[PDB]
Structure 1
Amino acid sequence: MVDINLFREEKNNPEIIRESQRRRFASVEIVDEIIKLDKEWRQRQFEVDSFRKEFNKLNKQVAQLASEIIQQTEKNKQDSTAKEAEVREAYAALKAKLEQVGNLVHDSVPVDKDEANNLVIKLWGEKRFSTPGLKLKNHVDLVELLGIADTKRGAEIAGARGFFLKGDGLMLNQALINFGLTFLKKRGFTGLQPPFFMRKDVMAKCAQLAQFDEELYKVTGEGDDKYLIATAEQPLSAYHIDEWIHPTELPLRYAGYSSCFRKEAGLGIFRVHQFEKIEQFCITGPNENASWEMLDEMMKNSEDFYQALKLPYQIVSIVSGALNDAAAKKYDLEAWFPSSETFRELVSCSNCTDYQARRLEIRYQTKQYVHMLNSTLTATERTICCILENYQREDGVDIPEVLQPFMGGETFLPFK
């Protein structure tokens, strides 16, 4: 939820919310609905203090003086707990409209309703193509040829889009997780591996609202009903819930690692239900444009990493209309897939400012909340598919150089 204070011309200026609503191609009226609703809530919270205030003007000098105004102090003491309710059903009606307002869209964000108008802002890398000596194979056919996944036996076991990693497939995955974690460790990041369970209660306060809520796997189990996490970002957001964080602790840098479960996948390993993910999770103070410097820091770390792997890519800024509710601004790094000659998304990078922080009561007198950003570094299975296509030869695949140490210095996976 956004800050009710960004709606009050008493403390202004609500037109900023109105602009954000326009850019999100969503209700501008709801900004008037909510102002009226706040008006009521703070009236009733004062129509309480009307009774509270009269209350010690009635019990002013009952003993220190006879009088029958103590039949009225029965009406008042009682009245104080009548308005006591009104406040509670005002605030709740206010919260039901407020919950629907997306985060304030940053002015740098391209305004448009369609991802088709999504804006490329940076290129890097020399893109391979099929020549007539080398017809470039797709990840699907390179996996089979290489013998490093069993999607057939995987599908009969876990159902559709289910895979085993096998032999040098498993080493590669593990190779990439450790390259990932050390890469981030060197840049001041602290590992966190969350549980792949989250209580629906907590999840309710997390993710990106009604869009990422009733579309996870359910786990029946032991205590409360639980979800399988879709993204390490979710649990990591819940770390530091209801906590205070001290200016001196910030910034915080968690290299998140977990297995990931998504219901909406659609035999390869790009389009899957289960997969592993390293993520950059970062908390900042809310002032001094600290979260905006941190977005650049994370985006640079994602670029540096895809450069280390020598994977050609392009960076796209996402249109205001495509931003989800938490995100104030967002980049994709889309990486080159030679066989099909398309860019595909391997990284998403978001500044969500205080939007989740305010829900998870993650505090920084008059209520300041911290800024939180999240940036996939590598979905390993996808990243591998990208690596197989870009490093293929006539009779196998060359291992990226940075990943050769974590594979015992092997440099080539031969076709079977």
Structure 2
Amino acid sequence: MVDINLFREEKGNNPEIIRESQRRRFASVEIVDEIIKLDKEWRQRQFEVDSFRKEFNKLNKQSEIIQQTEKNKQDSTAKEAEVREAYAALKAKLEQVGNLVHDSVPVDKDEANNLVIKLWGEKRFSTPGLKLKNHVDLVELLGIADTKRGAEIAGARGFFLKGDGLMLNQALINFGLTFLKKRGFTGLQPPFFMRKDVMAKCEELYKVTGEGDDKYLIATAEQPLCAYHIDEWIHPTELPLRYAGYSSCFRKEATLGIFRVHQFEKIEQFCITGPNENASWEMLDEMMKNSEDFYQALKLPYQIVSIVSGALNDAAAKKYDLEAWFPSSETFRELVSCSNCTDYQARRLEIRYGQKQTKQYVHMLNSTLTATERTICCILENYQREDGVDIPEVLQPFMGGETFLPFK
């Protein structure tokens, strides 16, 4: 949720900023007045208690009187119930309000109008010499995934990684983790389980039943790496925090191919900053430079698009995608999303900024470095030859010096 304080004229904050952000999200502007009207009620009860607190403690410092100090306690428990109700009803509207859309975000309702802002790399095309094959056919020819036997075993989109497929998957995971460890990141592998209560604050997911409470399978490392540091204080000397999240991922939405799948592995950049001095906006550039340097090391051409205000989800204040070149189909596909969600999750998760006045909260960002099966698919297409696939230079050490994967 957003800071109630940014709706209060009282504290020297203009609620038009909220109204403008609603407009840019093509969402209710009327709700900003609804919330102001509710906040005011609630703060009156919040105060309408301390009226009967003082009048209660006023009687004290002395049945035309003894019956007066009776009702003033019946009051301060009756009115405390009203305060509870007000808080609750205020939660129901404020919950619905998206994060404040940064001004640099292109305003529009269709991702069709996503603003390309950067290009990189010399894109390969089908020549007369070699028709460029797609990832689906190159996985079959290389013999590095059993999607057929996978499908009988795990149901639809189910796949084994095999031989140099597993070595490659593992090569990319360790290349990514070392890549990021060199840039000040600490590895973190979360449990693939998470309690629904906790997921709430961070049903398009798998439910796992058995030991304890019903839990979800995680769609992204980003979800466990957000619950981590719940209810904690983080000291300014700790921030900024850089975690290289690693995990398997389970998506419900998706017998040939490993691009459009139910289970996959993923390195995530997850960063916490303090909420002042433009720190989170500086970290968003930092993480986006890291995503860039990495696809450049792999020598995969790409373009960076900024996401229209209309397409930002409720947590994101701003978002880029790195779309990389798939030469057989001459398309760019999404291999990175890079979000600054500022204090939106932090404030629900009571993740605070102080030593331990009025409450400050940390800023949190997330940026896929690589979804391995997707990155592989992109590697296959861009590195293919007449009779196999060359291995990118930087992955060659992690594959024991091998430079080539021949077709069966």
Q: Shorter-normalised TM-score: what interval?
A: over 0.9
SS in 1 for 2:369: strand
Q: CA deviation at 1:5?
A: 0.1
The yes-or-no answer on 1:267 pairing with 2:256 is: yes
- C-alpha contact (below 8 Å) 2:307/2:319 kept by paired residues: yes
**Cα deviation digits, residues 380-402 of structure 1 (max 9, x gap):** 00000000000000000000000
SS in 2 for 1:37: helix
In structure 1, stretches of 5+ residues that fail to align are: 61-66, 207-213
**Cα deviation digits, residues 14-54 of structure 1 (max 9, x gap):** 00000000000000000000000000000111111111110
Return the alpha-carbon distance in structure 2 between the equivalents of residues 372 and 138 of structure 1: 37
Return the alpha-carbon distance in structure 2 between the equivalents of residues 46 and 246 of structure 1: 32
**Cα deviation digits, residues 239-290 of structure 1 (max 9, x gap):** 1000000000010000000000000019100000000000000000000000
**Cα deviation digits, residues 208-249 of structure 1 (max 9, x gap):** xxxxxx110000111010000000000000110000000000
The yes-or-no answer on 1:254 pairing with 2:249 is: no
The partner residue of 1:348 within 334, 337, 340 is 337
Return the alpha-carbon distance in structure 2 between the equivalents of residues 87 and 215 of structure 1: 35
Q: CA deviation at 1:59?
A: 1.1
- C-alpha contact (below 8 Å) 2:196/2:214 kept by paired residues: yes
**Cα deviation digits, residues 113-134 of structure 1 (max 9, x gap):** 0000000000000000001110
- C-alpha contact (below 8 Å) 2:115/2:306 kept by paired residues: yes
SS in 1 for 2:393: coil
Return the alpha-carbon distance in structure 2 between the equivalents of residues 185 and 45 of structure 1: 49
SS in 2 for 1:393: coil
Q: Judging changes above 3 Å, is the alpha-carbon distance between structure 1 residues 266 and 27 closer, same or farther for their aligned structure 2 residues?
A: farther
The partner residue of 1:229 within 176, 194, 218 is 218
- C-alpha contact (below 8 Å) 2:280/2:365 kept by paired residues: yes
Quote the residue 1:336 is aligned against: 325
- C-alpha contact (below 8 Å) 2:53/2:76 kept by paired residues: yes
SS in 1 for 2:361: coil
**Cα deviation digits, residues 181-208 of structure 1 (max 9, x gap):** 00000000000000000000100111xx
Quote the residue 1:3 is aligned against: 3
**Cα deviation digits, residues 86-121 of structure 1 (max 9, x gap):** 000001000000000000000000000000000000
1:2-21 alignment runs, 5 A limit: 2-11=2-11, 12-21=13-22
The partner residue of 2:80 within 81, 84, 91 is 84
Q: Could you state the TM-score of these two structures normalised by the residue count of structure 1?
A: 0.96
SS in 1 for 2:179: helix
Return the alpha-carbon distance in structure 2 between the equivalents of residues 51 and 267 of structure 1: 71
Quote the residue 1:320 is aligned against: 309
Return the alpha-carbon distance in structure 1 between the equivalents of residues 319 and 206 of structure 2: 26
The alignment's C-alpha RMSD in Å is 0.8
SS in 1 for 2:258: coil
Q: CA deviation at 1:302?
A: 0.3
Q: CA deviation at 1:68?
A: 3.8
**Cα deviation digits, residues 313-345 of structure 1 (max 9, x gap):** 000000000000000000000000000000000
SS in 2 for 1:413: strand
- C-alpha contact (below 8 Å) 2:147/2:255 kept by paired residues: no
- C-alpha contact (below 8 Å) 2:148/2:255 kept by paired residues: no
The yes-or-no answer on 1:218 pairing with 2:210 is: no
**Cα deviation digits, residues 37-89 of structure 1 (max 9, x gap):** 000000111111111110011112xxxxxx64111111111111000100000
Return the alpha-carbon distance in structure 1 between the equivalents of residues 40 and 142 of structure 2: 66
Return the alpha-carbon distance in structure 1 between the equivalents of residues 149 and 24 of structure 2: 48
- C-alpha contact (below 8 Å) 2:151/2:255 kept by paired residues: no
Q: Which moved more, 1:104-113 or 1:47-56?
A: 47-56
Q: Judging changes above 3 Å, is the alpha-carbon distance between structure 1 residues 19 and 47 closer, same or farther for their aligned structure 2 residues?
A: same
SS in 2 for 1:402: helix
- C-alpha contact (below 8 Å) 2:7/2:36 kept by paired residues: yes
The yes-or-no answer on 1:383 pairing with 2:371 is: no
Q: CA deviation at 1:297?
A: 0.2
In structure 2, stretches of 5+ residues that fail to align are: none
- C-alpha contact (below 8 Å) 2:305/2:323 kept by paired residues: yes
SS in 2 for 1:141: helix
SS in 2 for 1:233: coil
Q: Could you state the TM-score of these two structures normalised by the residue count of structure 2?
A: 0.98
SS in 2 for 1:52: helix
SS in 2 for 1:10: helix
Return the alpha-carbon distance in structure 2 between the equivalents of residues 266 and 4 of structure 1: 50
**Aligned-pair identity (%):** 100
